[PDB]
């Protein structure tokens, strides 16, 4: 049934989400290297995490847009929102953001006639989910949800990256005397430590090759412009 499909997609998505997240050597969190031009060389793993996030998000919007008629389109959306909710229960906030941000693309949001066919339970569920992962207040709700969270868990990495940039830009590496500012080293470590905690505990989920194959397929991917262009053909302005 729907719940079952949604469940295995969320579990396999979570395994993939967590694996990319866990492979980031903690050294990459030093010196906001992901903000430099040498990012792909200096922070290849953080970049892989970000790449993975855009892949999943694009995979979802593409599948939704490529659905033949209004009802299959609506049900694809209901399937994904259900997946986002299950991911929220598995504490895979990363997927919650990937999914809600994807479905929120202007190309999908403007599909007014399709949204009429989406259940009010689904629209309600989406609203709660977007609130949970809202970027307002530097992801206030998400940060709070993570504060009281026991792994296994997959946070949204961007939130921590931003916190680190904030510390990097606001405190000097060295003191006025030219000595290492240990105060700053500890501030940075404290953040890296929470991250490592979530990277270390793994999910007790067996992989499912067929589901994984489905999720890793790129054959139907549509870029940003193709997505909005297709949208215009499905529902003219």
- Could you tell me the CATH number of the domain that includes residue 68? 1.10.840.10
DSSP 8-state class, residue 58 = H
Nearest-angstrom CA–CA distance, 145 and 140: 9
Nearest-angstrom CA–CA distance, 198 and 214: 27
- Collect contacts of 231-235 with beta carbons under 8 A, ≥24 apart: 231/65, 231/107, 231/108, 231/110, 231/111, 234/65, 234/73, 234/111, 234/114, 235/110, 235/111, 235/112, 235/113, 235/114
Distances (CA, A) of 52 to 20, 47, 96, 111, 156: 8, 8, 14, 26, 12
Beta bridge partners of 174: 180
DSSP 8-state class, residue 104 = T
Q: Is the dihedral of CA 54, 108, 218, 11 positive or negative?
A: positive
Number of domains in the chain: 1
Distances (CA, A) of 181 to 13, 30, 49, 188: 40, 14, 30, 11
Distances (CA, A) of 200 to 26, 62, 195: 12, 33, 9
Distances (CA, A) of 1 to 37, 111, 135, 165: 47, 26, 33, 45
DSSP 8-state class, residue 171 = S
Contact 86, 130 (CB under 8 A): no
For 193-235, the three-class secondary structure string (H helix, E strand, C coil) is: HHHHHHHHCCCCCCCCHHHHHHHHCCCCCCCHHHHHHHHHHHC
Domain extent, residue 17, equals 1-237
CB atoms within 10 A of CB 169: 9
Query: What resolution, expressed in A, was reported for this entry?
Result: 2.2
CA 232 to chain CA centroid, nearest Å: 27
Distances (CA, A) of 150 to 38, 131, 156, 173: 35, 21, 15, 33
- The angle at the Cα of 125, spanning 120 to 131, to the nearest 5 degrees, equals 130
Contact 146, 155 (CB under 8 A): yes
Nearest-angstrom CA–CA distance, 76 and 96: 16
- The angle at the Cα of 235, spanning 231 to 237, to the nearest 5 degrees, equals 95
Six token digits for residue 190 = 């404290």
């Amino acid at each position: 049934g729907p719940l079952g499909s949604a469940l295995e997609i969320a579990e396999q998505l979570t395994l993939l989400d967590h694996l990319v997240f866990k492979s980031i050597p903690y050294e990459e969190f030093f010196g906001q290297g992901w903000m430099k031009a040498e990012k792909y060389e200096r922070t290849p793993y953080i970049m892989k995490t970000t790449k993975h996030f855009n892949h999943v998000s694009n995979f979802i919007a593409s599948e939704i847009i490529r659905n033949e008629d209004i009802s299959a389109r609506a049900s694809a959306i209901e399937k994904w929102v259900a997946v986002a909710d299950i991911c929220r229960c598995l504490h895979n906030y990363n997927a919650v953001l990937e999914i809600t941000s994807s479905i929120n693309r202007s190309a999908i949001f403007r599909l007014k006639k399709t949204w009429l066919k989406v259940s009010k339970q689904t629209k309600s569920l989406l609203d709660k989910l977007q609130k949970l992962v809202s970027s307002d207040g530097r992801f206030k709700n998400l940060r709070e949800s993570l504060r009281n969270c026991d792994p296994p868990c997959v946070p949204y990495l961007g939130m921590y990256l931003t916190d680190l940039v904030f510390i990097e830009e606001g405190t000097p590496n060295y003191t006025e005397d030219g000595l290492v500012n240990f105060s700053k080293m500890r501030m940075i470590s404290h953040i890296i430590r929470e991250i490592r905690q979530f990277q270390q505990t793994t999910y007790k989920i067996d992989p499912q090759p067929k589901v994984i194959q489905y999720l890793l397929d790129e054959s139907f991917m549509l870029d940003e412009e193709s997505l909005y262009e297709s949208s215009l053909l499905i529902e003219p302005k």
